[PDB]
Amino acid sequence: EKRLSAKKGLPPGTLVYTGKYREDFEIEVMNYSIEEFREFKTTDVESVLPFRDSSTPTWINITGIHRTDVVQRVGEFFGIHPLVLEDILNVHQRPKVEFFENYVFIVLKMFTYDKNLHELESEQVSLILTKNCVLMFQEKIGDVFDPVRERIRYNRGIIRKKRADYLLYSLIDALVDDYFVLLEKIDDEIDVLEEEVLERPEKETVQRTHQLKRNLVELRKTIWPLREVLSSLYRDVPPLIEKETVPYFRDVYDHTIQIADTVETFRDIVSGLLDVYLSSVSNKTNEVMKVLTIIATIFMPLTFIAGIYGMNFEYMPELRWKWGYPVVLAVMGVIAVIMVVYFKKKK
Amino acid sequence: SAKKGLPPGTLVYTGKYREDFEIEVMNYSIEEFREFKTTDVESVLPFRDSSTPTWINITGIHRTDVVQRVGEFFGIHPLVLEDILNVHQRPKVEFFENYVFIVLKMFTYDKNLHELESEQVSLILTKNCVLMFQEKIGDVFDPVRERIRYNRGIIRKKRADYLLYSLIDALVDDYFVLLEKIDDEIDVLEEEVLERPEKETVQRTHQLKRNLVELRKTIWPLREVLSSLYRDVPPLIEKETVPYFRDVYDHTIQIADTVETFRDIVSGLLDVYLSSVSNKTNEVMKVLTIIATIFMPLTFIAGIYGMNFEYMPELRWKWGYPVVLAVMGVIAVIMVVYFKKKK
Amino acid sequence: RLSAKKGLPPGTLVYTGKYREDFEIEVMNYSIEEFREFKTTDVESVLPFRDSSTPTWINITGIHRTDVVQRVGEFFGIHPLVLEDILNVHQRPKVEFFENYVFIVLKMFTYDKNLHELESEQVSLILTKNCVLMFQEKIGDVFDPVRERIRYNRGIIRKKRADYLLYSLIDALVDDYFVLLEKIDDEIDVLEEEVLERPEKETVQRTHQLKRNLVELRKTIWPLREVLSSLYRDVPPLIEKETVPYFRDVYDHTIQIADTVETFRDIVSGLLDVYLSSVSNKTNEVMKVLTIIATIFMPLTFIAGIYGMNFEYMPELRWKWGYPVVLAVMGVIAVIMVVYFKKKK
Amino acid sequence: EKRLSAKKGLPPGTLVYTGKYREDFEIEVMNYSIEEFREFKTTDVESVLPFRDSSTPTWINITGIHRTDVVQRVGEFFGIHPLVLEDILNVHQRPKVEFFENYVFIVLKMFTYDKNLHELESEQVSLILTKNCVLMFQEKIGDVFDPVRERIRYNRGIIRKKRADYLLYSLIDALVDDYFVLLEKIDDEIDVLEEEVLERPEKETVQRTHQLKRNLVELRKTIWPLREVLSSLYRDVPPLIEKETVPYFRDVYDHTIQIADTVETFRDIVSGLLDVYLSSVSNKTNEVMKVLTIIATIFMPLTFIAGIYGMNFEYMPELRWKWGYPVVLAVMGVIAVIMVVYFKKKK
Amino acid sequence: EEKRLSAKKGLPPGTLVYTGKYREDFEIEVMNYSIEEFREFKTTDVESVLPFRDSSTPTWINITGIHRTDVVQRVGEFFGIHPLVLEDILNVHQRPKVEFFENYVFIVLKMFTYDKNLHELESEQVSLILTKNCVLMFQEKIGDVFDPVRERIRYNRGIIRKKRADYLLYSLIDALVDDYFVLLEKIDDEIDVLEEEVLERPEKETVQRTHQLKRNLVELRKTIWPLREVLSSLYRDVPPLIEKETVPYFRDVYDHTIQIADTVETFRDIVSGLLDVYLSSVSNKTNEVMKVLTIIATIFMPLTFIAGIYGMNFEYMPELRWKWGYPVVLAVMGVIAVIMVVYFKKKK
Ligand SMILES: CCCCCCCCCCCCO[C@@H]1O[C@H](CO)[C@@H](O[C@H]2O[C@H](CO)[C@@H](O)[C@H](O)[C@H]2O)[C@H](O)[C@H]1O
Ligand SMILES: CCCCCCCCCCCCO[C@@H]1O[C@H](CO)[C@@H](O[C@H]2O[C@H](CO)[C@@H](O)[C@H](O)[C@H]2O)[C@H](O)[C@H]1O
Ligand SMILES: [Cl-]
Ligand SMILES: [Cl-]
Ligand SMILES: [Cl-]
Ligand SMILES: [Cl-]
Ligand SMILES: [Cl-]
Ligand SMILES: [Cl-]
Ligand SMILES: [Cl-]
Ligand SMILES: [Cl-]
Ligand SMILES: [Mg+2]
Ligand SMILES: [Mg+2]
Ligand SMILES: [Mg+2]
Ligand SMILES: [Mg+2]
Ligand SMILES: [Mg+2]
Ligand SMILES: [Mg+2]
Ligand SMILES: [Mg+2]
Ligand SMILES: [Mg+2]
Ligand SMILES: [Mg+2]
Ligand SMILES: [Mg+2]
Ligand SMILES: [Mg+2]
DSSP: OOSSSOOOSOOTTOOOOOSSOOSOOEEEEEEEOSSOEEEEOOSOHHHHGGGGGOSSOEEEEEEOTTOHHHHHHHHHHHTOOHHHHHHHHOOSSOOEEEEOSSOEEEEEEEEEEETTTTEEEEEEEEEEEETTEEEEEESSSOOSOHHHHHHHHTTOSSTTTSOHHHHHHHHHHHHHHHHHHHHHHHHHHHHHHHHHHHHOOOSHHHHHHHHHHHHHHHHHHHHHHHHHHHHHHHHOOTTSOHHHHHHHHHHHHHHHHHHHHHHHHHHHHHTTHHHHHHHHHHHHHHHHHHHHHHHHHHHHHHHHHHHHSSSOOSSOHHHHSOSHHHHHHHHHHHHHHHHHHHTTTTO | OOOOSOOTTOOOOOOSOOSOOEEEEEEEOSSOEEEEEESOSGGGGGGGGOSSOEEEEEEOTTOHHHHHHHHHHHTOOHHHHHHHHOOSSOOOEEEOSSEEEEEEEEEEEETTTTEEEEEEEEEEEETTEEEEEESSSOOTTHHHHHHHHHTOSSTTTSOHHHHHHHHHHHHHHHHHHHHHHHHHHHHHHHHHHHHOOOHHHHHHHHHHHHHHHHHHHHHHHHHHHHHHHHHOOTTSOHHHHHHHHHHHHHHHHHHHHHHHHHHHHHTTHHHHHHHHHHHHHHHHHHHHHHHHHHHHHHHHHHHHTTSOOSSOSSSSSOSOSSHHHHHHHHHHHHHHHHGGGOO | OOSOOOSOOTTOOOOOSSOOSOOEEEEEEEOSSOEEEEEESOHHHHGGGGGOSSOEEEEEEOTTOHHHHHHHHHHHTOOHHHHHHHHOOSSOOOEEEOSSEEEEEEEEEEEETTTTEEEEEEEEEEEETTEEEEEESSSOOSOHHHHHHHHHTOGGGTTSOHHHHHHHHHHHHHHHHHHHHHHHHHHHHHHHHHHHHOOOSHHHHHHHHHHHHHHHHHHHHHHHHHHHHHHHHTOTTSOHHHHHHHHHHHHHHHHHHHHHHHHHHHHHHHHHHHHHHHHHHHHHHHHHHHHHHHHHHHHHHHHTTTTTOOOSSOSGGGGTTOHHHHHHHHHHHHHHHHSSTTSOO | OOOOSOOOSOOTTOOOOOSSOOSOOEEEEEEEOSSOEEEEEESOSTTTSGGGGOSSOEEEEEEOTTOHHHHHHHHHHTTOOHHHHHHHHOOSSOOEEEEOSSEEEEEEEEEEEETTTTEEEEEEEEEEEETTEEEEEESSSOOSOHHHHHHHHSOOTTTTTSOHHHHHHHHHHHHHHHHHHHHHHHHHHHHHHHHHHHHOOOHHHHHHHHHHHHHHHHHHHHHHHHHHHHHHHHHOOSSSOHHHHHHHHHHHHHHHHHHHHHHHHHHHHHHHHHHHHHHHHHHHHHHHHHHHHHHHHHHHHHHHHHHHTTOOOTTOOSOOOSSOSHHHHHHHHHHHHHHHHHTTSOO | OOOOSOOOOSOOTTOOOOOSSOOSOOEEEEEEEOSSOEEEEEESOGGGTGGGGGOSSOEEEEEEOTTOHHHHHHHHHHHTOOHHHHHHHHOOSSOOEEEEOSSEEEEEEEEEEEETTTTEEEEEEEEEEEETTEEEEEESSSOOSOHHHHHHHHHTOSSTTTSOHHHHHHHHHHHHHHHHHHHHHHHHHHHHHHHHHHHHOOOHHHHHHHHHHHHHHHHHHHHHHHHHHHHHHHHHOOTTSOHHHHHHHHHHHHHHHHHHHHHHHHHHHHHHHHHHHHHHHHHHHHHHHHHHHHHHHHHHHHHHHHTTTTSSOOSSOTTGGGSSHHHHHHHHHHHHHHHHHHHGGGOO
């Protein structure tokens, strides 16, 4: 209803941004050949539009898809189907490839993990590969893509030698790689949490356990498709040159499996955290209940006799007598002493 | 859940909705549009033979004679019409030579008392018509009606199969709304489960589980109905409508992701609460334990010196018990010190 | 009684089930123009119907008479493995295919409410030429409505052939399951009500019985779904454009049941964890009462037991305005132990 | 006595018996056809070597494969691969069916169950179908094949009319039949066990349920390859006479499924047995609390007032107007009785 | 508990970077052999092994200490190994695999070492490349399971000397897969000891060990599953692996691996209940602690109140004055104590 999960009743072609980031808008362009390169930014689309006809590889990054107007304008110019456009704009959706005639279309998820308050956020990056362009579409400023920029700029690696497909591999290889980062953060979280779980009895322990479990589920929900998307890229290939670029997506495929597995491992672990915790607590109850028993179980028989020697009659034998009070205190010290002897097994 | 012993062709509305019956009909082509309502079935019949798209919506299928009649007129096999009127059944598609047959489920989720309801929606695509069969009045189809009416979208331009698409599409899109609500209820529940120790909570928890089960049982085959429509297409215009069906599938893959997601999420809730309440039990134990461990030994010396004995001064010595009182105070001091490793 | 008949050759004919009670053969030969039906204990009398040109339903009941299964089978030309398959009632439902005939094993269920339990009886069907052969363990069945349909000519059955009678028999036999499931659905409803609102061990027990019975149900129903999958997708002596879509309809109910049998499994599966939580909570709130009485009364008996001391020259007895204030302070700490207790109780 | 799971360092054909039984060695032969049959035992492997070339089905039962010379001889004569000989000797393994050029190889297990102290042992059985011979290999004297022996002697059934592949069939069907016996015993154990769990709270119970869980896991591991074992015997069939022996293989294969389902039915039943125990313990903990609390909650407050009225004070007596003792005992009984009243709901 | 080696990022596709924890050893071994004779040697000079690319006879070249990525790059370029394959030899956090190429088979496998006492398992990654007449082996660290295979080559044991490079690769992976037998045995011992502990030893360190075992099992499954797939691909495809000879051998290894994997899922099946068996014991001791607490509580508290109503200072109240009251109250108190014990004769 409000800013989550619903644009409803709108026709099949409606361009609407569903995410939260309306802040920034910036349009980056990097063109390159083996010979030379150029880069620029701008806030005007009419400058970048002519690159669709380029003979040389081009990476056009639109940050600020919160502007539906520029997404549309570009979609139209490169001839992107309106359903596809709409997918780019609706950022709540699963990861996918859709191959078309003159183009490939890809929807990926970048993540961010804040430790301290433990939570994750996800930005949607959409890539379109057509002709010589990779069109990028982001929500906000910030991204994992920088090493690629450096690779182009400082001529490191093979990127300069290759055409646009290997560039889509470059952007996808970065995006996938940052998941390892997120995963390191998360195993750190796991270790911390199992320490806390066996050794540190509070309820905030439970709260954090649960938080990690959800963060893990959302992680997987985005992850398994992400694996299939790479899986598809590997087995089909309409404009992705074979004998050059194929083993490159394939290495991103092995990554997305190594990752898909790692979150599984994570899951099987975190599931039994809470069991370990129940085992910590009901074991802590056991030791308390043992203390209260020996405390109660010594003083309960004693307070009884001390109460039968405080009873008022007349006619009573042992009150006058006497020799009693030392013999009574004797029997008391004796019975509590055989209690403590009886407890040489327990605690 | 039982109509038994009846012949294969027997029309029995098996639903719980007995109240309303209505017939809505919209005939459109590119240049013009015409809509009407009625309770008279024959009046909507001549539309079987037209060369333009028409949406014929029969609400209140508890009236069987209408279903029989319309069926016989459009030439639909009695096994289908029975299927239409038996509303406990899974979403499927049957592909036929002169038509397609589709059963789907709309859901409804009441907050306050938290519960869900289902309507069964049937669709026949034949020649130039979409035949829609609803159990009761009101639907998620209002934006579609508004679209045909107001020439929004491409819908006016298009044909009967694309009308189908818009109908099913609207249906599927509503689940999004339902998911948002379930999400909210889940938020509330987990808040309460870690912070609010009550049995009404375990109930609400189990009910949410049960609901997620019913929802899953519907959602999963729904994924499959679109799976065919996208992949099969005998009288469905290819180059035009196949990509659009492909969308509704995408979404219905999504809805099924979110639902497993919820099941995974809720499935650990009862272990939270168990872990939470097993802790609060432990931390009230401590309180009862300290209260028992100081005040039990103390009440013990109070009982010695209340004993009535002919021997034993105190009696005399007349100091008190500053010293009884002081030994109490000192052993209490050390008990509490001992409990500086605890509460 | 029992689960092993062993050391025996593959052909050997043995009834493994528990009911030796009844024996009866019922025959209905019916055509478009007319119909006739009779019963008997005499086997040579039904044999000639092999060559009848019209639909016959031979329901042989009391398979515990092995010699009749032998007779009829050898006569109609049914293999020895199929005959033994008819006499062994411990087995999974299956469909096997052959030249002149189709072999079918199904299960009818009876669930007693009150004392909650289920028993099964096995029906074997053989469709051969114009005859459909039926085999039961004991008197009574789910098939009366198709009998009624044949006697009174209701619906399309009189027009059509023998494999349509297969269709109808099976359909009836599948439809039973719906009512079964309704019953089991009731059991589940009461059982969960009890589980959250009613902490006893008998409810542990019934939860277990329900889980078990549900297991049995899944185990019968799942191959049963695979049965009508095969009758729908294969079809050699089954008239296609006429019967095959009637076949698909049972195929569809067979599926609906299976999903429902799952829903019940998934729901039963949690019913223990809801019980554990109610008991724990119940265990908690039982503990809280113990403490609050202790923590207000235990320190109370202590300061109330100081002034029961027989020491002379307390002096503190000297306050003898005294006791009401001595009573007061008690209540005060008592109250402040209660005033410890009006948050979190 | 049962060499552990490893013989390593050894090259691939190394023929080593890894089991515990060295005790007996015997060889039994039955040559038969429609007309007649001859049967004999022996310790001499030379006299059973000629039967490889038999026109008519022979059954060679070698018992005592600890004698590895024998297995080597026989193996080399009938043309069996060193890897399969090795497989006949190493008894820690899964069942399999390997189809070769001139012969069929099966390994299968023959279980034995001890009730009382509950545990299961398994002898290996190896079967090689070659030409007209069934080669059969056993660790120890005693087996399940005695009634197939009897059908060969007393000419019961159709076995004499039929061939070597039918011999194979009979043997496998006796194996498979025995797992029913086994399952019956496990069902008995299961019933006693669940009954003891729900009505009988002791620890040797958990010990037993666990024993069973494990035993069923073992039985699963032996049976599931087996289901696939007779699956591949049913669906393939190069030298297995089709129109004769095939519907008989499918018969064993139906059995094999009932056995597995009977296993899976058991598993899902046992995995609930511990949760039954869990819920019985936690109701006992509750029911003990209940008893502690009604005693604590009626008497501790009644002790508080008896209590103030025993105090010896300067203004003592506070009351001493004789009314007025029994009024206190009255209000004692009244607050106790209304404690019971308040407990007339649950406890 | 800090930044772990996982991410090699910002780095190009071909980047050769060792991600392991072993920097210690470096050694290059060679055995070359034929039916007539063989030569074995070590060296740190890579250029001396290189000519073996062109040998007619099978040559196993073991390169221990892949941390030196110049050696790894050398042998790679010289053998025409594609940079991505090279990089995989170098990156050790990754699942076992086969990849087949025009001129070589790349394989990734894993050796596991378990230590008892403090219970923990380390792995080492092994790479193998079937290329022409060579198998290139790459190890992180000295020591390995391939000793008997060397021993066979040296002293002419088995058939290995007659067969070729493909059978040499069979021999290597067979010794590898065969290690997992030992490993599963050790994990079994720990399992028995640990379930005994779970029932009969109520300590928190027991819990620590149960969870530790569980984690070890998961890391062990994660590797062990595709290990199965690696041998399956190897059985069923076979481009330069001589078929009618070497395929059955590869099949055998596949078999043990199916066994290996089955076992691993059985251990998992057991350790998953191991913690519920603990929590059963614990609740049960406390259960039988609370009993003790409650039966001591319920006999004396009705007794301490009977002792309360007695003194208790009031007038009238015989009771006190008729004598006989004290002993008769020892009788009542006593008898009610004995009927509490009698009611508790359904308990202990
Ligand atoms: C030297 C003085 C001579 C006085 C007259 C002698 C008469 C002979 C009597 C036999 C002696 C036994 O006397 C015995 O004393 C003991 C305690 O002293 C009493 O026992 C008394 O105190 C014990 C405490 O241990 C209580 O458990 C018991 O309920 C109470 O009756 C016995 O009830 C009485 O039978
Ligand atoms: C002082 C003389 C030195 C020589 C030693 C002998 C001293 C006397 C020994 C006393 C033996 C104690 O054994 C016994 O104890 C109980 C207290 O539980 C006393 O008192 C008991 O009397 C009878 C038992 O029959 C009961 O009615 C009463 O309830 C009970 O208290 C008995 O009178 C005494 O016989
Ligand atoms: Cl690059
Ligand atoms: Cl009919
Ligand atoms: Cl119906
Ligand atoms: Cl049988
Ligand atoms: Cl071996
Ligand atoms: Cl036989
Ligand atoms: Cl890498
Ligand atoms: Cl060798
Ligand atoms: Mg849409
Ligand atoms: Mg790689
Ligand atoms: Mg019906
Ligand atoms: Mg879309
Ligand atoms: Mg006093
Ligand atoms: Mg049999
Ligand atoms: Mg059979
Ligand atoms: Mg139908
Ligand atoms: Mg070996
Ligand atoms: Mg082997
Ligand atoms: Mg890389």
